């Protein structure tokens, strides 16, 4: 149907805007602390602590499959990256502090992304 095409075009254009958002958020992580999944070889207890691991690579895979239907879904995965790190790692650690800085800086980006998603539709 043409309606299914139009919906698919909307998903594609959302994906475009989320790709740009993802790039901008990841630039707020110049240390690359959140770039890849936590290795279960190197942190063998991780899944006892964190039930839904997340990282920028995993998000990028979902994005490229057009797997985010709306901005809320994408924000949920970003918040997991931050929140997981702030639970596993103590306040005095480079990891925790990196997450706070990513959260604070990412807020700015996400605030305007929400306006753009509502505005363009």
Curated annotation (Swiss-Prot):
Signal sequence segment: none
Taxonomy, superkingdom: Eukaryota
Boundaries of every Bromo domain copy: 9-113
Tissue: Highly expressed in testis.
Cell compartment(s), UniProt: Nucleus; Chromosome
Cross-link position per record: Glycyl lysine isopeptide (Lys-Gly) (interchain with G-Cter in SUMO2): 41
Disulfide bond entries: none
Protein's job: Scaffold subunit of various histone acetyltransferase (HAT) complexes, such as the MOZ/MORF and HBO1 complexes, that acts as a regulator of hematopoiesis. Plays a key role in HBO1 complex by directing KAT7/HBO1 specificity towards histone H3 'Lys-14' acetylation (H3K14ac), thereby promoting erythroid differentiation.
Subunit architecture: Component of some HBO1 complex composed of KAT7/HBO1, MEAF6, ING4 and BRD1/BRPF2. Component of the MOZ/MORF complex composed at least of ING5, KAT6A, KAT6B, MEAF6 and one of BRPF1, BRD1/BRPF2 and BRPF3. Interacts (via PHD-type zinc finger domain) with unmodified histone H3. Interacts (via PWWP domain) with dimethylated and trimethylated 'Lys-79' on histone H3.
Entry protein name: Bromodomain-containing protein 1
Species of provenance: Homo sapiens (Human)
Residues represented out of the complete protein: 555 to 674 of 1058
């Amino acid at each position: 149907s043409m309606e299914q095409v139009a919906m698919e075009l909307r998903l594609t254009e959302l994906t475009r805007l989320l790709r740009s958002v993802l790039d901008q958020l990841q630039d707020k992580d110049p240390a690359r602390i959140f770039a890849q999944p936590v290795s279960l070889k190197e942190v063998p207890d991780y899944l006892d602590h964190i039930k839904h691991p997340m990282d920028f690579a995993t998000m990028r895979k979902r994005l490229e499959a057009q797997g985010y239907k709306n901005l809320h879904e994408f924000e949920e995965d970003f918040d997991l990256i931050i929140d997981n790190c702030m639970k596993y790692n103590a306040r005095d650690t480079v990891f925790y502090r990196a997450a706070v800085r990513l959260r604070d800086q990412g807020g700015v980006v996400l605030r305007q992304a929400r306006r753009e998603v509502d505005s363009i539709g």
